[PDB]
């Protein structure tokens, strides 16, 4: 019975890997682990020398991983994402110098770019008639994994009183187990670009379908949002754990609550993702007021992160990042619907690959100027005031783009 065996030995294992690949309990507790008494890094040493390598090496490996993703048929890049995770935690636990943690962010930016591998692995593996049911279970097993990665990381630190050194040994056990699970994934019979079937062309038709889809007003509006707002969003997510260690420094690792602000951000990120399926098609004409109403909210919540200084007001900084990462994930289902509306799969993986590359270009520019010790070397509180201005400048562009479009004659 190959029908029932493919839903109990393949799909049930596919939603078991995607659950077990996204479980790293010490992933939110990386920056408190570096700044704590285990590694003894200065706060000005991981915000100007370690974390800007996460933005540089992401630019360097975004194109070679995406080309190796479709060439190797998506399975060894899920093994490369698993092996780079093990190589990140083997540098957290064993590396001590400032150069080893720059190598840790090089292996962490591999996993950050090879994350799409799994989301495009399901498209090339399962049949198109039964894709929206398998990918519906697969994303609901990843999102259940990301939630339980930050809950299990929080319950061990807070309830279990497990220190950060023993937590990363636990996270190393869930990552060596996810390498073993990634070895038994079935390679798809076909890929999207380099291993297609039925080999007018795949490049002459794609550069003509792009020429008739680049003139859509809803594609240029949401690709320009994906370049600039998704780059300033990821500049907050990298540097918000160095800011929570600046607001409330403890070295008392049972009151950190970086997993409770990474599980409630996934839970709010799943609610606002679910609540954007109605607005995705309903609020498409008012698509610049929707960007300039959320980016103005993100310009306030980033400024709220840069303004709190008392250690008793740290729970405002958690609720100004859960609301920040929750309001960004409201716009992404609206963004991926308006961009990938009339686009073929071969072009949807190219437009979102160009949008993620141009976001990483304009993230590398801000990380070299504002964040790195070569450009300016600004501390994290004097850097979030430059991301709140960047979000406010971005918010009064879509709002002034809405006055010049709504009140246009
Ligand atoms: N409701 C909803 N529909 C979407 O299409 C979508 N795409 C992203 N998101 C969420 O918004 C944020 C944007 O991160 P980015 O997309 O740049 O990195 C993404 C992206 O590079 C990759 N990825 C996720 N889904 C896909 C997908 N369908 N196809 C290709 N790549 C994907 O894996 C990373 C993490 O995604 P999620 O951790 O599941 O939630 C994301 C994320 O929190 C979405 N939320
Ligand atoms: N909750 C949730 N989280 C997600 O990450 C996600 N990704 C897609 N979906 C929805 O499930 C279905 C799967 O379509 P597929 O993903 O193969 O094409 C997707 C996907 O390949 C691509 N894409 C979406 N997000 C990203 C992303 N972050 N990065 C690169 N490519 C992406 O653009 C297409 C548009 O999908 P949406 O029209 O926005 O809703 C999808 C869709 O209904 C998601 N739902």
Report resolution in angstroms.
3.3
- Å from CA of 129 to ligand 2 middle: 17
End-to-end CA distance of the chain: 65
Phi-psi domain of 196 (left: phi exceeds 0; alpha: psi -120 through 50; beta: other):
beta
Q: What is the token pair recorded at 125? A: 């593996």
Q: How far apart are CA 203 and CA 116, in angstroms?
A: 22
The 8 Å CB, 24+ separation contacts for 349-356 are 349/120, 349/192, 349/193, 350/206, 350/210, 351/210, 351/213, 351/219, 351/223, 352/226, 353/66, 355/223, 355/226, 355/227, 355/230, 356/62, 356/226, 356/230
Q: How far apart are CA 404 and CA 383, in angstroms?
A: 31
The 8 Å CB, 24+ separation contacts for 343-352 are 343/209, 343/213, 344/206, 344/209, 345/123, 345/192, 346/192, 346/193, 346/202, 346/206, 347/206, 347/209, 347/210, 347/213, 349/120, 349/192, 349/193, 350/206, 350/210, 351/210, 351/213, 351/219, 351/223, 352/226
As a whole number of Å, the CA-based R_g of the chain is: 21
Q: Which residues contact 293 (CB under 8 A, 6 or more apart)?
A: none
94 closest CA partner among 168, 146, 41: 168
Q: How far apart are CA 138 and CA 393, in angstroms?
A: 38
Contact yes or no for 390/302 (Cβ under 8 A): no
Q: Whose CA is nearest to atom 8 of ligand 1?
A: 332
CA distances from residue 218 to 284, 328, 341, 372, 406 in whole angstroms, order as listed: 8, 18, 9, 35, 14
- Lookup result for tokens 């310009």: 299
Cβ–ligand 2 distance for 135 under 6 Å, the answer yes
DSSP 286: S
Q: What is the token pair recorded at 132? A: 């929206």
Q: How far apart are CA 3 and CA 53, in angstroms?
A: 47
- Å from CA of 3 to ligand 2 middle: 26
Q: How far apart are CA 230 and CA 235, in angstroms?
A: 9
- Å from CA of 336 to ligand 2 middle: 6
Q: Whose CA is nearest to atom 42 of ligand 2?
A: 132
Output the DSSP codes for 19-67: HHHS--TTSTTSHHHHHSTTT---HHHHTTTTTHHHHHHHHHHHHHHHH
**Residue 397 marked in a binding site:** no
| HSE-CB for 88 with a 13 A CA cutoff | 25
**Longest Cα–Cα distance in the chain:** 65
Q: How far apart are CA 21 and CA 176, in angstroms?
A: 10
CA distances from residue 242 to 27, 43, 89, 252 in whole angstroms, order as listed: 14, 7, 19, 16
Contact yes or no for 114/81 (Cβ under 8 A): yes
Q: How far apart are CA 154 and CA 148, in angstroms?
A: 9
What is the enclosing helix (H) or strand (E) of 393? helix 381-406
Burial class (CB in 10 A: 0-12, 13-18, 19+), 2: exposed
Tell me, letter by letter, the H, E, C secondary structure of 187-243.
Answer: CCCCCCCCCCCCCCCCCCCHHHHCCCCCCCHHHHHHHHHHHHHHHHHHHHHHHCHHH
164 closest CA partner among 280, 33, 303: 33
Residue numbers of the domain that contains 215: 2-407
Q: What is the CATH number of the domain that holds 262?
A: 1.20.1250.20
- Å from CA of 159 to ligand 2 middle: 36
Q: How far apart are CA 321 and CA 330, in angstroms?
A: 14
Q: How far apart are CA 377 and CA 48, in angstroms?
A: 6
Q: How many CB atoms lie within 10 A of CB 210?
A: 16
- State whether residue 159 is helix, strand or coil: helix
Contact yes or no for 153/259 (Cβ under 8 A): yes
Q: Whose CA is nearest to atom 3 of ligand 2?
A: 139
Q: How far apart are CA 109 and CA 107, in angstroms?
A: 5
Length of the chain: 409
Number of independent structural domains in the chain? 1
Q: How far apart are CA 335 and CA 226, in angstroms?
A: 8
Q: How many CB atoms lie within 10 A of CB 265?
A: 24
Number of the ligand closest to the Cα of 58: 1
CA distances from residue 28 to 133, 161, 167, 324 in whole angstroms, order as listed: 31, 16, 11, 16
88 closest CA partner among 61, 107, 109: 107
CA distances from residue 141 to 101, 149, 389 in whole angstroms, order as listed: 31, 12, 37
Q: How many CB atoms lie within 10 A of CB 364?
A: 19
Ligand 1 proximal residues by C-beta, below 6 Å: 115-116, 119-120, 142, 230, 269, 273, 329, 332-333, 336
Burial class (CB in 10 A: 0-12, 13-18, 19+), 183: exposed
**Residue 3 marked in a binding site:** no
């Amino acid at each position: 019975d190959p029908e029932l065996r493919s839903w109990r030995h393949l799909v049930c294992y596919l939603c078991f890997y995607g659950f077990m690949a996204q479980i790293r309990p010490g992933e939110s507790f990386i920056t408190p682990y570096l700044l704590g008494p285990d590694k003894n890094f200065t706060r000005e040493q991981v915000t100007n020398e370690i974390t800007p390598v996460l933005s540089y090496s992401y630019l360097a490996v975004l194109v070679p991983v995406f080309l190796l993703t479709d060439y190797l048929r998506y399975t060894p890049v899920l093994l490369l994402q698993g092996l780079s995770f093990v190589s990140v935690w083997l540098l957290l636990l064993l590396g001590h110098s400032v150069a080893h943690m720059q190598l840790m962010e090089l292996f962490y930016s591999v996993t950050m770019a090879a994350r799409i591998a799994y989301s495009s692995y399901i498209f090339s593996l399962v049949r198109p008639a039964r894709y929206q049911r398998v990918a519906g279970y697969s994303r609901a097993a990843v999102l259940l994994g990301v939630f339980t990665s930050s809950v299990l990381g929080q319950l061990l630190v807070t309830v279990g009183r497990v220190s950060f050194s023993t937590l990363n040994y636990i996270s190393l056990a869930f990552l060596t187990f996810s390498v073993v699970l990634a070895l038994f994934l079935k390679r798809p019979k076909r890929s999207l670009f380099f291993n297609r079937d039925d080999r007018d062309s795949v490049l002459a038709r794609m550069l003509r379908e792009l020429g008739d889809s680049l003139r859509r007003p809803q594609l240029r509006l949401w690709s320009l949002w994906w370049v600039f707002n998704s780059a300033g969003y990821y500049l907050v997510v990298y540097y918000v754990h160095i800011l929570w260690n600046e607001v409330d420094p403890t070295t008392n690792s049972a009151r950190v609550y970086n997993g409770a602000a990474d599980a409630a951000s996934t839970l709010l990120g799943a609610i606002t993702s679910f609540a954007a399926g109605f607005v995705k098609i309903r609020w498409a004409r008012w698509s610049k007021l929707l960007i300039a109403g959320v980016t103005a909210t993100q310009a306030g919540l980033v400024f709220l992160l840069a303004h709190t200084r008392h250690p008793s007001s740290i729970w405002l900084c958690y609720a100004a990042f859960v609301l920040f990462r929750g309001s960004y994930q409201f716009l992404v289902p609206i963004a991926t619907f308006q961009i990938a509306s009339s686009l073929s799969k071969e072009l949807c993986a190219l437009v979102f690959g160009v949008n993620t590359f141009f976001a990483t270009i304009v993230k590398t520019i801000i990380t070299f100027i504002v964040s790195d010790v070569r450009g300016l070397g600004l501390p994290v509180r004097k850097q979030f005031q430059l991301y709140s201005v960047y979000f406010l400048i971005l918010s009064i562009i879509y709002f002034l783009g809405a006055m010049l479009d709504g009140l246009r004659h």
